[PDB]
Amino acid sequence: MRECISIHVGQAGVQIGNACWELYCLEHGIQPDGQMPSDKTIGGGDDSFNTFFSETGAGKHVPRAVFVDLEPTVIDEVRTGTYRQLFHPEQLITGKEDAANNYARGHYTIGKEIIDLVLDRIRKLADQCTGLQGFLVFHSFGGGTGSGFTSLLMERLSVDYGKKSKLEFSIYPAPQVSTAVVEPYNSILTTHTTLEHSDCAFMVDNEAIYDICRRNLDIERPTYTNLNRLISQIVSSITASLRFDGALNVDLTEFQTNLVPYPRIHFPLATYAPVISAEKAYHEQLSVAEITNACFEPANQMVKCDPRHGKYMACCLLYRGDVVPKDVNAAIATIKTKRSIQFVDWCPTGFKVGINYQPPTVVPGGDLAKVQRAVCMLSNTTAIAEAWARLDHKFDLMYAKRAFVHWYVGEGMEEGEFSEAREDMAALEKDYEEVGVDS
């Protein structure tokens, strides 16, 4: 009835997709080979998981996902792993050479070789839908494929579909921790090119999740798997309203309607609570008010920034499980009372509420404790202007010397595109400065 297509671009996208699809199969009881042990009805019915899983053959559920990568390493990890029989063999699309953390490669040189194949696969998936709401694109800014090919695919999908919601789950470049030396270039170019072709891009940060795993989960040494599982919990909290009925449902279009005040400001920060280990779970009364208050703690934000340095323009609180709406009402009123949580004057109604019935599902061998309820906050705040200014300063420092510029110019990039992207980023910084002014 209502379908959603997930697109996983780059290594980060594919790994987060592995985590998300493990969590989906756990929540819906789908075996790793697509079979269902309680498969009483075959060939129809509801079975609300038709949003992400399509019924094929006789008693097999195939994810509505396209995995895209330019090198075969990660997709081959997928092709020979636990869920090799889950995905359609043609949904796992690979090139032959990586983008080498080069936006120019993944956008012009290499992305042009498989963009048509990816779009044809996406078209084949979309033709099997009757109520396709939108797409979910998982990627990272500071990467190669996940930046250049992500922007190219966003442009092509904006051309082909147009009015379908285009949501992104992006790994924002951390302010201190980093992987690539040329992350500012790729991040600025991606932001410039995919800005007007995206509806809502959810921001997460590896450094903030590191800090959350250290402080809250009591994990001194987490790997990328723990980060991927937490991001998967966030994704499941976002899509649970589609996959499960609740007291107050929120489809995907309501996110872009409620969280995006202006067409150029669509970067809401992800936040999840409660995130606690199993040891301290027995010593806390995880009430609605406690989790609602923990959602606004500066130490619990999934992006390394300080919300107290800015104002909230739009906030979305998605509750799950044993949640009473009166308690949500009271907790949000208490939040509005606090003077340390500043909202813009031009948004007197600042919250959007969603309440589901399905409690969070514990992944076997996971980190998070079994809780009765959880809240995922998607807040659009002006505090991300500081992160954008930091990225702009790094970009300026690297570009004033023309460092690494030849690596992009020799791949089909015209040098003026750097200047154009930088001017647009300055304009975006001015946008964020202007919306934060009370008048």
Binding site: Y262, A426, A427, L428, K430, E434, S439
Partner: peptide
């Protein structure tokens, strides 16, 4: 540089 969103176009 100038902003691009029209947040003040009809400030009346």
């Amino acid at each position: 540089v100038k902003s691009k969103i029209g947040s003040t176009e009809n400030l009346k």
